[PDB]
């Protein structure tokens, strides 16, 4: 027995590797789960979260605000092309729409 | 006792924007997003393993599931992040 070191710090991540492993084991996905799968999955989830949060914080600063709100989340997602492709059929509550008026209707 | 990703999302937020908060509604939306992505990837990996008559879900299945589900440059930088974490975790055993 030695000092207990978490697998998250072992892999250099912030997301919970052990919790991810338990969910994979209990989710009726396959008979057995390999050792590197939770690490890979946690890394991917953390990367996507970081991307979205950086864009949303940029929008919040552009609005001269300190706290991120669903409007900022929606603006970032709909303004990023790859994120818009990924979250194509998702509705964000209290998000609103992008400002856009067709050219023909303008005076 | 209900478990969520709130503390980890907050840690990533502090890493990215050191002076910036988040409201509880936005945190709930981020929770929904993480759960949704987890489900998509796990389902794709399970389908792959069943297709190839395997009984184990390894890091190879996760890597192929990410390539099928993420578009364009998002997949390239995600695959690089996942590979780096596995090789760093193996070095320390």
């Amino acid at each position: 027995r030695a000092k207990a070191k978490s697998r998250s710090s072992r892999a250099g991540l912030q997301f919970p590797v052990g919790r991810v492993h338990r969910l994979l084991r209990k989710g009726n996905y396959a008979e057995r789960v390999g050792a590197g799968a939770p690490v890979y999955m946690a890394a991917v989830l953390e990367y996507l979260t970081a991307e979205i949060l950086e864009l949303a914080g940029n929008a919040a600063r552009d609005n001269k605000k300190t706290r991120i709100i669903p409007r900022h989340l929606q603006l970032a997602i709909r303004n990023d092309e790859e994120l818009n492709k990924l979250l194509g059929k998702v509705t964000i509550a209290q998000g609103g729409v992008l400002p856009n008026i067709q050219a023909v209707l303008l005076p | 006792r209900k478990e969520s990703y709130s503390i980890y999302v907050y840690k990533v937020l502090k890493q990215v924007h050191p002076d910036t908060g988040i409201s509880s509604k936005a945190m709930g939306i981020m929770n929904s997003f993480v759960n949704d992505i987890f489900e998509r990837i796990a389902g794709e990996a399970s389908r792959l393993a069943h297709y190839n008559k395997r009984s184990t879900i390894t890091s190879r299945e996760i890597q192929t599931a990410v390539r099928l589900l993420l578009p364009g440059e998002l997949a390239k930088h995600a695959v690089s992040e996942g590979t780096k974490a596995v090789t760093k975790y193996t070095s320390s055993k």
């Binding site: 991307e51 950086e54 | 890493q15 990215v16 050191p18 930088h77």
Partner: peptide, 7 residues
């Protein structure tokens, strides 16, 4: 701070 090479 943490930044992205994709942006």
């Amino acid at each position: 701070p943490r930044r992205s090479s994709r942006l």
